[PDB]
Amino acid sequence: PLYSSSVPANYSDPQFAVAVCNNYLHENYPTVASYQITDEYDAYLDMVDGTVACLDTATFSAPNIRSAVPSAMQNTLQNVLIAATKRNCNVTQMRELPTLDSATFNVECFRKYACNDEYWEEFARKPIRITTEFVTAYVARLKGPKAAALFAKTYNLVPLQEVPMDRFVMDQVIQAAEPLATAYLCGIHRELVRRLTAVLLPNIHTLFDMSAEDFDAIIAEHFKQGDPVLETDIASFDKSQDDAMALTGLMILEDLGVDQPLLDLIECAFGEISSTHLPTGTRFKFGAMMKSGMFLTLFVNTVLNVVIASRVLEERLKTSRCAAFIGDDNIIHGVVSDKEMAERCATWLNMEVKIIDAVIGERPPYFCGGFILQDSVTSTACRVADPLKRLFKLGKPLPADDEQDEDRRRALLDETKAWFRVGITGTLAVAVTTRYEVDNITPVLLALRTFAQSKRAFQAIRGE
Ligand SMILES: [Mg+2]
Numbered sequence: 001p002l003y004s005s006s007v008p009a010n011y012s013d014p015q016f017a018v019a020v021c022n023n024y025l026h027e028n029y030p031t032v033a034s035y036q037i038t039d040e041y042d043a044y045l046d047m048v049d050g051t052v053a054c055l056d057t058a059t060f061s062a063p064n065i066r067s068a069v070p071s072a073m074q075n076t077l078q079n080v081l082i083a084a085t086k087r088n089c090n091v092t093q094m095r096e097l098p099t100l101d102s103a104t105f106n107v108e109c110f111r112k113y114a115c116n117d118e119y120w121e122e123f124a125r126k127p128i129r130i131t132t133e134f135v136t137a138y139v140a141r142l143k144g145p146k147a148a149a150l151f152a153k154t155y156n157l158v159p160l161q162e163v164p165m166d167r168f169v170m171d172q173v174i175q176a177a178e179p180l181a182t183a184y185l186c187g188i189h190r191e192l193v194r195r196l197t198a199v200l201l202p203n204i205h206t207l208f209d210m211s212a213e214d215f216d217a218i219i220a221e222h223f224k225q226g227d228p229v230l231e232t233d234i235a236s237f238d239k240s241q242d243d244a245m246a247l248t249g250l251m252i253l254e255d256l257g258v259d260q261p262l263l264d265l266i267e268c269a270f271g272e273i274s275s276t277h278l279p280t281g282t283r284f285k286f287g288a289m290m291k292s293g294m295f296l297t298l299f300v301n302t303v304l305n306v307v308i309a310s311r312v313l314e315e316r317l318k319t320s321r322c323a324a325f326i327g328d329d330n331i332i333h334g335v336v337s338d339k340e341m342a343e344r345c346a347t348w349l350n351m352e353v354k355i356i357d358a359v360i361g362e363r364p365p366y367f368c369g370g371f372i373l374q375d376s377v378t379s380t381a382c383r384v385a386d387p388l389k390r391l392f393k394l395g396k397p398l399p400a401d402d403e404q405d406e407d408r409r410r411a412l413l414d415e416t417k418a419w420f421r422v423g424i425t426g427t428l429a430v431a432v433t434t435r436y437e438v439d440n441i442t443p444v445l446l447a448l449r450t451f452a453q454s455k456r457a458f459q460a461i462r463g464e
Contacts, residue, residue: 018278026275030081030267034277038073040284041294045071046393047404049411050368051298051327052207057186057291058141061193061209063414065326067369068389076239076297076304079246080253081267086243087250088260102244107251109311110303113318115199120255123195128257130187132157138183155180165261172268178289181269185292188262192299195256201318206302207326207368215324216382222322222333223381225374229365230316230335231356232309235328237349239304248307249300266296301327308353312345329368364431371431377423384424385415387441388432390448394461405458413452419445 011017025034048054050067086096093100111117132152140148151157155167155177163184168177193208200206207215223229239245258266273289284290305325309317313335317323322333337355345353358365358372360381365372370383390412398404419428425442432441451458 022275022277025277026271029271029274030078030085033075033078033274036277037274037290037293038075040286040290041073041297042071043284044286044291044294045073051329052210052212052368054294054298055208057189057295058138059186059190061190062211062213063411065207065210065212065215065368065370065383066385066411066415068386068393069369070393072235073294073297074239076246076249076300077266077270077293079240080250080300081263081270083243083246083250084263084267087247096243099243099247103247103251106244106248106307106311107255109314110248110252110307113310113314114201114204114306116201119195119198123255123257126257127259128188128191128195128262129162130184130191131162132159134187134190135163135180135183138186139179151179165265169265169268172264174269174272181265182288182292185266185269185296186288188258188266189292189295189299192253192256192258192296196299196303199256200306203320203322204306204317205322205324206306207324208299208302212383218322218324219372219382220380223360223372223374225361225379227360228334228336229358229360229372230313230332230337231358231365231367232305232312232330232332232345233354233356234305234308234352237352239301242349245304249304252303252307253300298327305330308349311348312341312353312355314344316341324367326368331365331367331372364434366435371428371435373424373427373431375421375423376427382418382424384418384428386432387415387419387428387445387448388436388438390415391444394448394451398462400462405462406455409452409455409458412448412458416445416449416452420449 011020025032045051045054048056050065050069050071052065052067053063055061055064090096111120136148136152136157139151155163157163157167163180168174168180168184174181193206196206205218269289270293273287273293302325305328309323309325309330309332313320313332316335317332320332320334324331337357342355345355356366357363360372360374366386367383369389370385372381373384374381394412419425425445428445429441432438451461
């Protein structure tokens with residue numbers, strides 16, 4: 001090997017190197033984004049036990065749906081912003097027209113089979129704008145009612161008036177108004193959840209604001225013994241290899257009121273935390289700007305989940321008694337796959353999305369790391385967390401944290417209460433054996449309940 005002479009050069013101060021690295025990642029967002037963003041997402045999802053339990057905002061959107069399946073998030077928001085730049089510029093159609101035709105057809109299927117047409121005109125003439133009242137109530141929910149008074153008087157906020165954009169973005173960049181920007185983008189997610197709920201048909205449910213019991217009420221009413229349940233597994237399908245998926249989410253976001261001034265605010269805010277790469281610290285800071293992007297990513301992922309179901313199922317989704325969506329997980333009641341349905345899923349995404357047929361009682365439907373089982377005493381269907389996935393998750397080595405250990409124990413205590421319902425334990429062990437081809441899980445249910453009983457017993461999981 002013949003190498004040319006290597007002569008390196010450096011800056012006079014390490015702080016100049018820190019700023020250069022942060023400025024580079026800031027200047028090249030959203031073209032590239034560090035995988036530490038999605039890695040911080042995964043660390044937060046795994047900590048709070050799944051997507052539905054990842055609701056800890058000041059104002060959201062009785063425990064939540066807790067899943068032990070490890071998270072593998074992808075920066076869907078970054079790809080949406082990339083599609084916004086390729087659309088604002090690049091008027092030259094470099095075969096982005098077939099991407100445009102595909103995304104247009106996706107929005108067509110989404111509207112035809114999953115939506116009403118009542119609110120599209122209102123959202124077009126009234127884009128999403130966050131008012132002074134929300135951002136003041138947002139800070140009041142965190143730092144007290146008085147700190148919200150200083151919040152409004154510091155940034156000169158007028159009551160019952162939309163927060164002017166010139167207060168936190170100019171020349172863009174967040175101009176030292178970090179708590180105002182974070183407050184604004186928390187209201188965008190709240191309005192996006194409210195507006196999506198308004199357009200979706202009543203038989204189509206998104207699990208943003210839904211407790212475990214409130215979701216069980218929907219399951220108990222619509223899911224009976226012998227009822228077929230369809231499932232579209234999209235977890236293995238990467239959205240980045242479809243520019244139409246990112247363009248589809250962008251169009252639906254725009255259809256909901258995310259106009260160009262809003263996208264510029266979103267791209268500017270999330271290009272700023274990409275400039276918080278260095279210094280790293282010892283652990284993820286788990287900030288509110290990080291959470292806002294996770295929820296926006298989760299929102300777009302959930303919408304694209306409904307889109308995929310709308311195009312594949314067509315009228316079968318519209319006539320379904322009950323269809324639930326959150327993240328990439330979904331169940332659709334009373335639909336059995338056919339040849340024309342499996343073909344549409346094949347010629348569209350190849351063999352990247354599968355169709356799973358399940359029945360209440362014999363082939364247990366799976367949803368958010370849990371089984372849809374029917375109680376053998378009340379004959380009412382419900383969702384029961386996967387005990388095998390919980391056992392796998394409990395093997396993760398963790399540093400000592402007495403507060404988080406109590407949260408993990410109380411979360412396991414709640415899961416064991418559902419496992420030992422006298423009408424659940426039998427059919428649960430049948431479901432685990434049916435799904436995983438393993439031996440009877442009941443002795444593990446016994447052992448897991450031992451750990452959850454007391455704080456002293458939970459210590460045996462970590463040991464000494
Ligand atoms: Mg549109």
